[PDB]
C-alpha cells in the first residue's frame, strides 16, 4: 500500500503454482497413466496456477 | 399440397431426433465448468434429457464454452470448433464467454468468445446457476425445434 | 435482541469417526464353504 485507496502491488501466492513445478520430478520413472494420478493427487486448479 | 406436408412432417421428425439427443462437448476452462458439473449432478441431471455427460469432441453436437477464453487459448478453441461435425451449435455460459466479464479490459483476455466462434445461446451470470444453464439448454432445444431446413430446401 | 444463536442446551453430538462395520465370515469358514460347494458339485 502507498497510502492511497488502491493497492500499489498485490502478489498472489498460490499453493498450486509450486506444486505443478514439482510435477516433472514426481513423475520421473512412472508410466503415462500414472501421470494423470499425480496431477490428481495435487489438487490443481488452473485459476490459481496462472492467476 | 402433398409435398409440402411431407417435407413438413419430415422436418419435424429430424428436428425432434436432433433436439432430443444432444451430445455436448464442454470446455473446462474456469468457474463455469464447476457449475456445469453441478448441473450434471444428480439434483439437476442433464442426462435425463438425453444430454449425455462429457461426450467426445469428435462426435459431439453442441459446444459449451464455460470459462474465460484467453489469447493463448483461442486458436485451440477455433481448431476444436473446426473439427466438429455439422450440425453444430455453440453455447456461451457466464460473463467471461459472453463479453469478457471481470477481465474485459485485460491485455490477454478475448472480449467475448463470439469473436472466434458463432454463438447461438448466451447464458448470463457469474456463474449462472445450474438451473440457468439447464434453461439455456432447453431454449437451445426450442431453437432447434423450430428449424425449417427441409421447407427451405423444397421452397428453393 | 433476536439473533441467530444456538439453542440454550447446545446441539446434539455429531459423529466424525471412521465406521467400517467389520461384517462377514472368516477366511476358514469361507474356504470351508468353497470346498463344500466343490465336493457337492463333484459328487
Amino acid at each position: 500500500s502507498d497510502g492511497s485507496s488502491r493497492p500499489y502491488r498485490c502478489k498472489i501466492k498460490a499453493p498450486g503454482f509450486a506444486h505443478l513445478a514439482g510435477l516433472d520430478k514426481m513423475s520421473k520413472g512412472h508410466m503415462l497413466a500414472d501421470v494423470v494420478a499425480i496431477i490428481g493427487t495435487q489438487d490443481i486448479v488452473f485459476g490459481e496456477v496462472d492467476r | 399440397s402433398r409435398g409440402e406436408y411431407v417435407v413438413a412432417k419430415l422436418d419435424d421428425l429430424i428436428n425432434w431426433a436432433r433436439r432430443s439427443s444432444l451430445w455436448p462437448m464442454t470446455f473446462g476452462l474456469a468457474c463455469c465448468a464447476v457449475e456445469m458439473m453441478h448441473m450434471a449432478a444428480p439434483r439437476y441431471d442433464m442426462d435425463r434429457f438425453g444430454v449425455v455427460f462429457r461426450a467426445s469432441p469428435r462426435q459431439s453436437d453442441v459446444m459449451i464454452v464455460a470459462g474465460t477464453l484467453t489469447n493463448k487459448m483461442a486458436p485451440a478453441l477455433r481448431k476444436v470448433y473446426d473439427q466438429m461435425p455439422e450440425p453444430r451449435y455453440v453455447v456461451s455460459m457466464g460473463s467471461c464467454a459472453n463479453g469478457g466479464g471481470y477481465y474485459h479490459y485485460s491485455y490477454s483476455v478475448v472480449r467475448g468468445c463470439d469473436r472466434i466462434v458463432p454463438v447461438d445461446i448466451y447464458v448470463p451470470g457469474c456463474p449462472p446457476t445450474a438451473e440457468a444453464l439447464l434453461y439455456g439448454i432447453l431454449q437451445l432445444q426450442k431453437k432447434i425445434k423450430r428449424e425449417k431446413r427441409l421447407r427451405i430446401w423444397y421452397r428453393r | 435482541v433476536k439473533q441467530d444463536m444456538p439453542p440454550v442446551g447446545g446441539y446434539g453430538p455429531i459423529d466424525y469417526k471412521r465406521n467400517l462395520p467389520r461384517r462377514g465370515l472368516s477366511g476358514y469358514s469361507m474356504f470351508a464353504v468353497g470346498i463344500g460347494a466343490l465336493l457337492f458339485g463333484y459328487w
Partner: protein, 176 residues
Amino acid sequence: TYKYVNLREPSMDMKSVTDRAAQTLLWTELIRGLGMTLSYLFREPATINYPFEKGPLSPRFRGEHALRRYPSGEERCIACKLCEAVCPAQAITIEAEPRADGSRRTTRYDIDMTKCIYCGFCQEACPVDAIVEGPNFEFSTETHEELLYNKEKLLNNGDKWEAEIAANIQADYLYR
C-alpha cells in the same frame, strides 16, 4: 494433536494371514463395493423435474437487475452515480440532466450484463434502494446485444418484478 494415517502393522498369525489370503482369493472388498452400489440403486434419486420444479432459493438471491419506483410512480434513482463508482467491472454507465420539473433524474442508465459479475455492490451502495438484483435467472438470450440493458429495459424489469422484489426487500432489509 496429530494422528498417524496408514501406520498399521498387520498381524502375522495364521488366522489373519488366512483371512487376507481369502480376501485376495475370493474378492471380498470387490463384493463390498458391489453391495454398496446395489444398496445405492434402491434409494430414491434426488432428481427434480425441471422446469416443473425449481431449486430452493433465499430472498438474498442476486439475479437480473431492475430499477425500482416509489409507491407513487416516481422513480427512486436520483442520479447519484454511486453504483457506477462502486461497480468493479465498470458495467454501469450513467448520464444525467435535470428534467422539466427540475428534479435530479437520469437520462441514460446502461448496465452491460456481459460485463457484470453479479456481485450486488450496486444494490448495497444505493442510498434509495433504486437499483436491485431481482430473483429472475431464466433470462438467457440468443443475441449478444440483447444483453445490453438500457434505462427502458431496466424500468420494464422493475415494473415486471416489483411484486416479488418488494417482498424480498421486506423479508431481508432487517439484516442490512
